[PDB]
């Protein structure tokens, strides 16, 4: 793989090559990508979507904003070192270290843009609707991969659809740079085969059958290595994933302490190695509020993990470029012991808290209900009832079903509740 | 067809004839009909039933009072002209113009008394239960007409049931005068054949199979003309049913439009744009310009347009009187209006902005489930009356098969919108 | 049958006998039983469970806890008075073995306190919701993997039998549940039989059953220790009721008969105009009418009537017990103490009035209908999760509701049954999106 091709400024439908040395740096293609996401309706809808808990708790937007800030640091630092490793990238082709930060930042900002309401239970509720719910009727009218798209409905693949979806008057969706689309794709494979290896890149899939032709174009332009289609990941996708990993590990922990779900004493206990070399003890002892102490620990822990993740990337750079790196960056951390205890305590005290369990069980019913109304109106567009269902909710069979799943996933948590209540009369 | 017979004062079960000349005029049978409806439980129920929208919106009760006011005016005006044309009706039989107003007013007061909650979505929901719901099983156990009663459940035919339901100690329901029942019957036919013609009188049906013998008696007393050539029974409409229909048409056309404007669903500009031809000859323009509130300007336009359409409807009825009396009239009175293009524009704008507004759609979807659930609970208990849950269902909702099914539909339609929601909530445990 | 054995102090697991004469009277095993119930989690949950009328905040309604409190106070008084007369009739019981009259009050008080501890929420619709779920609902599936009695336990699920399970359930670190004295467990057991054969007679002791197949071995140990008389020689086991069970039952009969009426008047379900007409025979000789007429609140007039009638029925029930004591001791008494009452017709009139005005009120009907859906829903979600514990949704259902096949189904029923009215409705509401 060549870094010159991985940093493609191509946008969908382009008929001519876009050279980095010819860009107006006030309107750098990569930085425009960030701006286009910020102003888009799917990104705005993350305002009203839940990260884990439904006081102050992170939403998907605040989470995605934090991931994109950590991603920008990761990208800037790795970029600076990539340019010194391969000076021809700057001296011949005109790349600057802020381009790498721009690509990671925009990819990170978009990384959860396709996730449904109710988080990852929402994804499972949609897949369950097709595996065992009303949606099972379509199994024999779908290909294996079309049906696998639905029963393993994947927010990452839905995000790729959201970003690139064509409609009349808007070909190519947000028309992001191919480099940014590359850095977004952390599972560059279709739904089948299911987990062909133990690599994190094979854990899920990254695009629906409906988007396969589009990612084939992205991968061709980027020069991704071929690995049923799948490719070795764009190197920058490891930094997006690292940023995301860092944020939800540390920030969910912080949230759980401030919510009273995790006793505060665990904070220093699990984070002391992560902050020991950089913490100002006099500052820490002077801070009077739990929230101020835990936010200080979090800033230090995140900075420690950013630095290590940059070093892990550079150490394994050629292995990532050859598609032979077998782990995530955070899997290689020296703090893996502490990261594990943090995640396990978060799972115990937050993810399995009664209120989270209750919301996730309720979301199953809410999404199963909205999906069944949509599919029934699709099957019988004739009855009076199904004509009203269409005015209320939606004013090839595979393409109809994948669009039904996509539209349900654009719904905020609140809006999913209201439309569900009306269908049931509440 | 003879107006003497059409103005029958007979009540159900009467053994002897009631002469008009022998009525006490302080207690005229036709006027008693109006009073009996006002004090009846089914009429009071209309206070919490939706006309179009579930802020102030017309309820089924307020709509019905307005129809009966417009209808009394029509009947009074027509009655005066009928008595000049047929002076023997007053000189020999003792009828008077107010009698025609009272018949139309009472029938208009009750014209929507059998309509289920949630408007037309309501009826559509009841029909689908027996066409596309738990109710199909009963098909092989019912006659073709008995099943058509259910899959095309008609609020108009339920109204006839409500007005005449016999019960121990109360045979004949409200026991309304046969002339009033004749004026109530817009569709004097049974459920089959389905739409045998383009005439509005055959668009639906007017009585269930369980009330067929009663309307046979009414139609015989009234001397309504037979119209169906087949075994299926159909009769030509009582002339006064055209007036009840015109008062209904005038009110929901103009008044729904007014509601839509006052609610913000229809921009005020359309009020003058669509109604100028209807009011142009009678509007006091400086009075309109002096009115400050939108609501008062549009209530002024409504009053003028209703006055115009009332005078035109009387003229249409008198122009086609002999064709109506002969069963050959092919249309509604409003169908022959010079303002049919303005009426149609008002209706289509009302449909587009009111009936297809999100607020109304959401309510209709919600009504569909509510009714759907209640019918299923009642019917499951009918089939297995022995279990404990179904004994509870019986106690909560209702303390021959067709006779049972048409009664379940009638009891579902009786319920107010609130009563329907609450019963639904508890069946689902909320 | 012997009173010395019927008054057993044995607790489950005892390797050595407990002689009454060697008990510390400040730590009497029977009175420890009462205190163990007061502090138990199952008894605390009765605070949030309807007895008959759904709970409100606008008015006071009896919960299962307040009802059980009242039954144990009436039962203590029955046991005390019956105890003194029994000690006078069999004076060897006190002079040799050391029994005191307050022992009998303590046994009845504790069994009465616990008598409704296993009942499912929302009343007997709760029981029939559970039963029908396995008769014809999703639970039908398991019929063929279960014995006739294991299945009968489910399709005729009984709160009395679940109460016995609740009181003795063994869990890690807590073998034998509350470990109540066998005498208290005998006074608790008013239907000492398994689920089959079904109603083998018209005797009130055969109207239901008292223990599940999972508890059969324990009640066999209990009946042996107590020396209860056999009522079956087949492999379907059955025993004559512990005599003190007749006093628990009477205390219960007295309380729900008179106190449902009291609640119905205070809630306005029964017109106050009926209070004296239905109580006059029960209270006519002891009522102070001038005092009654001087009371200015309805709730005071009706509590005075209730206290007079309860006093009347306690005295009579003590006399009925002693007049039939040898028949009861021989297991040949065929009815309840209240069935023999001279006020039988008035009791029946009060009960029918309550059925008409309270049990058939709209609110009680609404609750039973709502209960059927709430419990059927919870049972369906528990049982589907049991059959496919691998799916993500079923792992959530397990975390929300419960963090051998018969042993699993009987445990699911017991766990659903011990849910309070509120927790059951909340869980129902979340499973259904609200
Ligand atoms: Mn994320
Ligand atoms: Mn109308
Ligand atoms: Mn009790």
C-alpha B305/C-alpha B300 separation (Å) is 9
Find chain C residues with C-beta within 8 A of A357's C-beta.
396, 399-400
C-alpha C342/C-alpha C348 separation (Å) is 11
C-alpha C96/C-alpha C73 separation (Å) is 29
How remote is the CA of residue C395 from the centroid of ligand 2, in Å?
54
By three-state DSSP, how is residue B346 classified?
A: helix
Find chain A residues with C-beta within 8 A of B365's C-beta.
385, 388-389, 392, 422-423, 425
Which ligand is closest to the CA of C163, given by its number?
Answer: 3
Q: Which residue in chain B is spatially nearest to C360 when comparing CA positions?
A: B395
Q: Which residue in chain B is spatially nearest to A395 when comparing CA positions?
A: B358
C-alpha C50/C-alpha B324 separation (Å) is 66
Q: Do A236 and A100 touch, CB atoms closer than 8 A?
A: yes
Q: Do A25 and A247 touch, CB atoms closer than 8 A?
A: no
C-alpha C31/C-alpha C72 separation (Å) is 12
How remote is the CA of residue A206 from the centroid of ligand 1, in Å?
15
Query: Which of B356, B368, B424 has the CB atom closest to A385's CB atom?
Result: B368
Q: Which residues, in sequence order, are bridge partners of residue B63?
A: none
Contact C400 A354 (CB under 8 A): yes
Which residue in C275, C277, C324 sits closest to C303, CA to CA?
Answer: C275
Q: How far is CA A218 from its chain centroid?
A: 18
Backbone phi, psi, residue A110, to 5°: -90, -5
Q: Which residues, in sequence order, are bridge partners of residue C239?
A: C230
Contact A128 C431 (CB under 8 A): no
Q: Which tokens sit at B258?
A: 């007014």
Contact B388 C429 (CB under 8 A): no
By three-state DSSP, how is residue C392 classified?
A: helix
Q: Which residue in chain A is spatially nearest to C427 when comparing CA positions?
A: A358
Give the side-chain half-sphere CA count within 13 A for C202. 1
Q: Which tokens sit at C238?
A: 């059955």
The subunits that touch chain C, with at least 3 C-beta pairs less than 8 Å apart, are A, B
Q: Which residue in chain C is spatially nearest to B423 when comparing CA positions?
A: C366
Distance, in angstroms, between C402 CA and closest chain B CA?
Answer: 23
Contact B368 A383 (CB under 8 A): no
C-alpha A297/C-alpha C396 separation (Å) is 32
Which ligand is closest to the CA of C251, given by its number?
Answer: 3
Where are the strands (E) in B172-293, listed by range?
A: none
Which ligand is closest to the CA of A46, given by its number?
Answer: 1
C-alpha A288/C-alpha C350 separation (Å) is 67
Which ligand is closest to the CA of A109, given by its number?
Answer: 1
What DSSP string runs through A323-371? T---S-TGGG-TTHHHHHHHHHHHIIIIITSHHHHHHHHHHHHHHHHHH
Contact C400 A361 (CB under 8 A): yes
Q: Which tokens sit at B406?
A: 């048409």
What DSSP string runs through A395-426? --HHHHHHHHHHHHHTS-HHHHHHHHHHHHT-
Sign of the CA dihedral with A154 first, then A155, A160, and A162 last = positive
Contact B366 A424 (CB under 8 A): yes
Count the neighbouring beta carbons within 10 Å of the beta carbon of residue B323.
12
Convert B392-408 to b/e letters by CB count within 10 Å (16 or more is b): bbbbbbeeeebeebbbb
Contact B393 C360 (CB under 8 A): no
CA C376-C117-C188 angle, 5° bins: 125
């Amino acid at each position: 793989a060549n870094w010159e091709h991985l940093l493609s400024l191509k946008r969908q439908g382009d008929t001519a090559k876009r050279l980095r040395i010819e860009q107006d740096d006030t309107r750098l293609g990569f930085e425009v990508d960030y701006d286009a996401i910020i102003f888009s309706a799917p990104f705005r809808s993350l305002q009203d979507k839940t990260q884990v808990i439904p006081d102050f708790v992170h939403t998907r937007l605040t989470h995605s904003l934090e991931v994109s800030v950590v991603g920008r640091s990761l990208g800037r630092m790795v970029g600076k070192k990539l340019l010194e490793k391969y000076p021809h990238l700057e001296q011949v082709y005109g790349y600057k270290f802020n381009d790498f930060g721009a690509i990671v930042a925009a990819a990170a900002l978009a990384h959860d843009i396709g996730n449904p309401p109710f988080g990852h239970s929402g994804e499972k509720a949609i897949g369950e609707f097709f595996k065992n719910g009303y949606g099972k009727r379509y199994k024999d009218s779908l290909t294996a991969k079309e049906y696998q798209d639905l029963i393993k409905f994947e927010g990452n693949a839905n995000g790729f659809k959201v970003l690139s979806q064509s409609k009349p008057g808007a070909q190519g969706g947000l028309r992001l740079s191919y480099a940014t689309l590359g850095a977004f794709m952390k599972y560059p494979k279709e739904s089948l085969p299911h987990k062909p290896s133990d690599h994190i890149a094979d854990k899920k899939y990254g695009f629906f059958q409906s988007e396969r032709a589009l990612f084939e174009d992205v991968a061709q332009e980027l020069g991704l290595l071929k690995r049923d289609v799948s490719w070795s990941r764009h190197p920058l996708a490891y930094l997006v994933e690292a940023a995301d990993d860092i944020c939800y590990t540390i920030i969910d922990f912080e949230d759980g302490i401030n919510l009273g779900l995790i006793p505060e004493e665990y904070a220093l206990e699990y984070m002391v190695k992560l902050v020991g070399q950089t913490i100002d003890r006099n500052k820490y002892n002077a801070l009077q509020e739990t929230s101020d102490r835990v936010s200080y620990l979090r800033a230090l822990a995140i900075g420690t993990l950013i630095n290590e993740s940059v070093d892990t990337f550079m150490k394994y750079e050629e292995e990532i470029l050859a598609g032979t790196f077998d782990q995530s960056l955070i899997d290689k951390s020296n703090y893996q012991a502490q990261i594990t205890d943090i995640i396990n305590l978060s799972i115990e005290r937050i993810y399995n808290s009664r209120e989270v369990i209750e919301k996730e069980i309720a979301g199953y019913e809410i999404l199963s209900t909205l999906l069944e109304a949509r599919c029934r109106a699709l099957d019988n567009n004739d009855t009076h009832y199904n004509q009203l269902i269409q005015q209320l909710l939606a004013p090839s069979l595979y393409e109809n079903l994948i669009q039904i799943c996509a539209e349900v996933s654009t719904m905020t948590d609140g809006k999913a509740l209201r439309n569900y209540k009306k269908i049931k009369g509440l």
